[PDB]
Design a protein around this nucleic acid. Structure first.
Ligand SMILES: [Mg+2]
Ligand SMILES: [Mg+2]
Ligand SMILES: [Mg+2]
Ligand SMILES: [Mg+2]
Ligand SMILES: [Mg+2]
Ligand SMILES: [Mg+2]
Lengths: 63, 67, 145, 69, 141, 206, 80, 141, 107
RNA sequence: UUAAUUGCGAUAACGAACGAGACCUUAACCUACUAAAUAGUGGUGCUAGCAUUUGCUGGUUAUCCACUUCUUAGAGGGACUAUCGGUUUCAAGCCGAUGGAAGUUUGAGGCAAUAACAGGUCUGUGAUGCCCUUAGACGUUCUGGGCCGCACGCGCGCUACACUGACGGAGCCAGCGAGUCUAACCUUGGCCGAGAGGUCUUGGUAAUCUUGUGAAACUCCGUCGUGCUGGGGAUAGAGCAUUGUAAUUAUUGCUCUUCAACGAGGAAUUCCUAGUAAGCGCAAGUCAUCAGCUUGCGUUGAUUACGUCCCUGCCCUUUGUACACAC
């Protein structure tokens, strides 16, 4: 299964009822200009790099 | 948690306005001159006054300041 | 200080004063299975019998076994200052005894039987199943002991 | 469950199998043989003075041994 | 080639010197050894039989050479540990005073430890002759 | 290079460490590059260290523990569960034994093996109990690369602790059994299965 | 005898003596004088003696069984 | 006459004084050499000031070291610290600054604790809990 | 009675270091102006006395534990002079709170 | 935005006070002042020892010289977030690098406002009103028991269930205190005893002597090899000592021996963010002896997050009220 990499650009804020979840805006270093927001758990910074199984899902729990 | 009491801010604002040619953009000289142009009951409090004054006046070098 | 290898001139489990000593273990901790004998009382008497501690009670000899049973019933005759026995300065004769395995209960029942006879507070505590050593039973040791 | 003494049907297995073991420990011998801990403990003590395997680290409670050559 | 008792690890220093005392055979053991636990914090006597007194002597023999003057009380404190006092928590219990005092007295007979009028017991002129010779042994093989 | 005569004679095995800033005396710190992306900059490489035990001020800020050396990181995660809180000397010797055992097998770089292991066993997608109550739903979340590494180091330790508890086995070899299993990828160890359980639950409730 | 001696002297600026005011508050109330009246008397004298501020707190039941506590203050008082 | 320096090194409770002066390459710590520090796993934990700058900078110096206070590993941190500062202060006063400077950049890049004390200090406990911040276990029932 | 050195040692302790410093600096400067051979002031580790006590006169309340302190500074000053010259400046001007301990050394 | 009604701002409010802060104490540094035989150091007047050709140590301060590096306490200096970078209405501020002993209010406490509770205390008081008692007393004292009695339910605790271990030998390092002439206090050292302990001398009213409290955890090597086993010492019979006038209901300590559940613990629930949690002991309080308790002190020293209103509690604003003794 084609696991793909993603690279954080903006940590848009912290979300989740208990504060655990984070919404960060990531980019793709392969096949660039694809920008998607994701709901992330652990601590994260700017320019961070992470792994996504899938790209066909936005981050939902906003505000 | 670095927010200063009015005692630091009011003294810093009052000090700089009537002593701007006396002050200088360096903290070490500012804390030294403050010992003679003002009466402060603690060195820690005196440093807080001089720390804000050398912080206020860098922004004085960057354009105007209101108040 | 040297290390010697061992060979299997073995014999398996056997009885010992109606107390089946567990095999395949070192002799001192095998003699702990003998009632009225602990780790201390087994270590000393084994050193008296000149036996190596690493015999593992399996490659021993009957000649050493008949030596230690003599030290069991008659320990004072193998250089002990007589403060080391199970029953120090007993009631019956004032002599220091070491009650062996099978009959620790008999002197235990007779001790309580005397306490039951004398009608002392201790003996009444024993029959009622309460705590004799002054331990509080209000909220501890409730269902057992 | 496990053997407690050393005899020829158990000694020859120890000699014929311990070489080509990459790693030998007290528990590995108890896992791969019927010997106990102290029987395993005299194993790593003995066979090194015969020099069949080479010591890399020497520590109490922990065997760190590698086959020689 | 100067070697005091400072340049050998204290682990194999005592092992050699107690074995040096093993072949010497004139340490004057008090005769009640190999049965006493040497500490109320110890629930079973020392495991070694033939040379544990040599271990006790050699370890102690380092202590007077390390220190200035040592009575029985200091050596009593040093070798005691923690006692399993039962269902209650642990506590430091002082060791046995009979052995270590006699250990000092036994090593007095050898000619190793003086009477030390400024305190407890101190090293002798012959006290470090065997020590530095065994120390000279233990570094070079 | 050439031996240097000092009035304090330092042994040959330890005096040679100056020519290359290695581990204790045996293992190197080169070719430790990571095969798996997104974990570089979050596992400590190119900071050569002589020991897994240091007085490291690493919790005063948010990411000082990200620069904490990974061989120290696993020791600190080991030194816990009640009877082993404190006692970092226990942790540093266990890894000193474990690094010996792990290079007995698999002659390659031991730090590279655990670097392979930490990449392999890091919880890759974790659930989140969205909704404030028991009658709620789980939602699958991409895990932070630090949080992947930080959690999984405990998964190596919690597996070897379970293996070493009430068994003939000892903690050093079971750790060296747990690192080789995670590095290979087998689902035979404890950490890989617990990583896989988090993944299989995550895919169900994306 | 002779190893202990006494010199009795008078306190200056009596209005700054918190202890000395307290019995004059105590003595005025033991006669039958009104609690409100005495408490106003003491604070005025203390304030006029140069003090920055004085606070007088009388506590206890007064003409009613359910006790009440009331305060009497002037000037500047600080507490920390 | 004879040139010397004397620097200290402190920890949470430990301290250590070292006297760096001209010699023939001697290290000694409480008499026993640096090779004989305790324990065997922390022996190497003090060699980093030697290893980073080389034994070639120790040709013409002898080092005398005393350590007191704290606990077993705390001295090792204190021993390695005053040793590091002792060399740095020595090479500053009698050698060109770059030799001192090359020591300084090397030590700081690897571990700043060799030339800097660790300002982490204990926090006193508070009534209501056995720890500094830990509290008694209340119940509500 | 003609310049007889006596090895006189003066020990001073107090509870107020402000009052204690006044007295100690006076004897020191008195000997300095009389050009004695002077062992400078040596201040002992200031001992602190602790009494922890529950605030509650009863037992009711949260487990609060107050603790009071007394601070005990201590100094010993040694002088080298004949008896007659030093007794005139010691018997007088002793500031309260400073219990003076003058002793003689025979070393 | 802050830990803060802490500030910037908006602004029918402006200028203030209390509280918060500021302050004080304490921990963190100073090769720069003052010094010290109640502390230490190096040389050595005088010497001494060995392995030796020079390393450590017995020492002496008119039976030597010098000093504060370490220890100490007086005077200060030091941090005010400092410089820079980023971001904010470009404000108050927050993030990071660097330098620095130190950048979480520098860490922590002392104090801590108005109003209130039918909170607790009459069992601290010779602080106290009213009632009761007052000679056969609810006054005062003496003896013995009880407060600890034990089918049960609940709270705070220590020991564990083992190999990250127990046991034996060895290595072996702290800090905060306390201690008697207003007499039997801390006790060193010698002797005897397995041990607890007994006896004789000795220093200390205490930076001097106990004391370097040579604490424990910890480290090295050997015994054990998964077995309720040598994990566990509950329970119980014996003997030996100490404190007390008295130890029986076992005051406690020591030795032999007896050898239970306990195989990590349901619902439920406690505390905690760095020298912190936790492990480990020590010192003091009480105390003639009894700590599994408390207050402190040191040893080893984690994991995890720099967030939110999901539960819980509190506070504010809006709103409803037939509540105001206030659901
Ligand atoms: Mg205020
Ligand atoms: Mg405070
Ligand atoms: Mg009520
Ligand atoms: Mg101390
Ligand atoms: Mg209590
Ligand atoms: Mg309505």
């Amino acid at each position: 299964t084609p696991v793909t990499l993603a690279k954080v650009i903006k940590v848009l804020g912290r979300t989740g009822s208990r504060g655990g979840v984070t919404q960060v805006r990531v980019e793709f270093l392969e096949d660039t200009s694809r920008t998607i927001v994701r709901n992330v758990k652990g601590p994260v910074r700017e320019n961070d790099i992470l792994v996504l199984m899938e790209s066909e899902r936005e981050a939902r729990r906003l505000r | 948690g670095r927010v200063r009491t009015k005692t630091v801010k009011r003294a810093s604002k009052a000090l700089i306005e009537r002593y701007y040619p006396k002050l200088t953009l360096d903290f070490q000289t500012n804390k030294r001159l403050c010992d003679e142009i003002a009466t402060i009951q603690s060195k820690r409090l005196r440093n807080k006054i001089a720390g804000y004054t050398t912080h206020l006046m860098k922004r004085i070098q960057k354009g105007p300041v209101r108040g | 200080s040297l290390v010697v290898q061992e060979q299997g001139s073995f014999q398996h489990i056997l009885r010992l004063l109606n107390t089946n000593v567990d095999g395949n273990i070192k002799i001192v901790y095998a003699l702990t299975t003998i009632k009225g004998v602990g780790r201390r009382y087994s270590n000393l008497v084994c050193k008296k019998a000149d036996v190596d501690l690493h015999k593992r009670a399996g490659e021993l000899t009957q000649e050493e076994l008949e030596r230690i049973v003599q030290i069991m019933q008659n320990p004072t005759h193998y250089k002990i200052p007589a403060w080391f026995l199970n029953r120090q300065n007993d009631i019956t004769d004032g002599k220091d005894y070491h009650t062996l395995a099978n009959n620790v209960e008999s002197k235990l029942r007779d001790d309580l039987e005397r306490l039951k006879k004398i009608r002392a507070h201790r003996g009444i505590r024993h029959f009622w199943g309460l705590r004799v050593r002054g331990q509080h039973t209000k909220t501890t040791g409730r269902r057992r002991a | 469950q496990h053997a407690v003494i050393l005899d020829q049907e158990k000694y020859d297995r120890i000699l014929k199998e311990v070489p080509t073991y990459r790693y030998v420990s007290v528990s590995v011998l108890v896992d791969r043989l019927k010997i106990g801990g102290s029987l395993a403990r005299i194993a790593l003590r003995h066979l090194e003075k015969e020099g069949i395997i080479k010591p890399i680290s020497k520590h109490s409670k922990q065997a760190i041994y590698t086959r020689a050559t | 080639p100067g070697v005091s008792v400072r340049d050998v690890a204290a682990q194999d220093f005592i092992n050699a010197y107690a074995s040096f005392l093993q072949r010497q055979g004139k340490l004057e053991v008090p005769g009640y050894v190999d049965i006493v636990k040497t500490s109320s914090g110890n629930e079973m006597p020392p495991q070694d039989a033939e040379g544990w007194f040599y271990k006790r002597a050699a370890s102690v023999a380092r202590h007077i050479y390390m220190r200035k003057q040592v009575g029985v009380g200091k050596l009593n404190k040093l070798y005691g540990g923690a006692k399993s006092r039962g269902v209650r928590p642990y506590k430091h219990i002082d060791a046995s005073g009979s052995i270590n005092r006699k250990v000092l007295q036994a090593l007095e007979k050898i000619g190793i430890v003086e009477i030390s009028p400024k305190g407890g017991r101190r090293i002798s002129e012959n006290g470090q002759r065997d020590l530095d010779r065994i120390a000279a042994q233990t570094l070079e093989e | 290079f050439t031996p240097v005569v000092l009035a304090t004679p330092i042994p040959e095995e330890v005096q040679q460490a100056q020519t290359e800033i290695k581990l204790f005396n045996k293992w190197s710190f080169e070719e430790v590059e990571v095969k798996d992306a997104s974990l570089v900059d979050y596992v400590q490489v190119r900071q050569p260290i002589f020991v897994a035990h240091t007085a490291g001020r690493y919790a005063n800020k948010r990411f000082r523990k990200a620069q904490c050396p990974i061989i120290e990181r696993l020791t600190n995660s080991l030194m816990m569960n009640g009877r082993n809180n404190g006692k970092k000397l226990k942790a540093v010797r266990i890894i000193k034994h474990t690094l010996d055992i792990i290079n007995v097998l698999t002659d390659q770089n031991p730090i590279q093996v655990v670097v392979d292991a930490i990449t392999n066993t890091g919880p890759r997608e974790d659930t989140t109990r969205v909704g404030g109550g028991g009658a709620a739903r789980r939602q699958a979340v991409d895990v932070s690369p630090l949080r992947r590494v930080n959690q999984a180091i405990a998964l190596l330790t919690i597996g070897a602790r379970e293996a070493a508890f009430r068994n003939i086995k000892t903690i050093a070899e079971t750790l060296a059994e747990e690192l080789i299993n995670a590095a290979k990828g087998s689902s035979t160890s404890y950490a890989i299965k617990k990583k896989d359980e988090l993944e299989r639950v995550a895919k169900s409730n994306r | 005898p002779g190893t202990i001696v006494l010199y009795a002297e008078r306190v200056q600026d009596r209005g700054l003596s918190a202890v000395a005011q307290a019995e004059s508050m105590k003595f005025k109330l033991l006669n039958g004088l009104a609690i409100r009246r005495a408490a106003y008397g003491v604070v005025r004298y203390v304030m006029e003696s140069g003090a920055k501020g004085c606070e007088v707190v009388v506590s206890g039941k007064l003409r009613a069984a359910r006790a009440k506590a009331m305060k009497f203050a002037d000037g500047f008082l600080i507490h920390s | 006459a004879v040139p010397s320096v004397q620097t200290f090194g402190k920890k949470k409770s430990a301290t250590a004084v070292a006297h760096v002066k001209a010699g023939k390459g001697l290290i000694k710590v409480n008499g026993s050499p640096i090779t004989l520090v305790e324990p065997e796993i922390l022996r190497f934990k003090v060699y980093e000031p030697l290893l980073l700058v080389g034994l070639d900078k120790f040709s013409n110096i002898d080092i005398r070291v005393r350590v007191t206070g704290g606990g077993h590993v705390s001295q090792v941190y204190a021993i390695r610290q005053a040793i590091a500062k002792g060399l740095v202060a020595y090479h500053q006063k009698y050698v060109d600054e770059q030799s001192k400077n090359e020591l300084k950049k090397a030590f700081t890049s690897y571990d700043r604790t060799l030339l800097i004390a660790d300002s982490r200090r204990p926090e006193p406990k508070k009534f209501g809990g056995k720890g500094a911040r830990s509290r008694f276990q209340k119940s509500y029932r | 009675q003609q310049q007889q050195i006596i090895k006189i040692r003066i020990t001073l302790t107090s509870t107020k270091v402000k009052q204690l410093e006044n007295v100690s600096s006076n004897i020191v400067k008195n000997a300095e102006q009389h050009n004695l051979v002077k062992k400078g002031p040596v201040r002992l580790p200031t001992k602190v006395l602790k009494i922890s006590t529950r605030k509650t006169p009863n037992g009711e309340g949260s487990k609060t534990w107050e603790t009071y302190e007394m601070r005990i500074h201590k100094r010993y000053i040694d002088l080298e002079a004949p008896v007659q010259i030093v007794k005139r400046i010691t018997q007088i001007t002793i500031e309260p709170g400073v219990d003076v301990e003058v002793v003689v050394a025979s070393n």
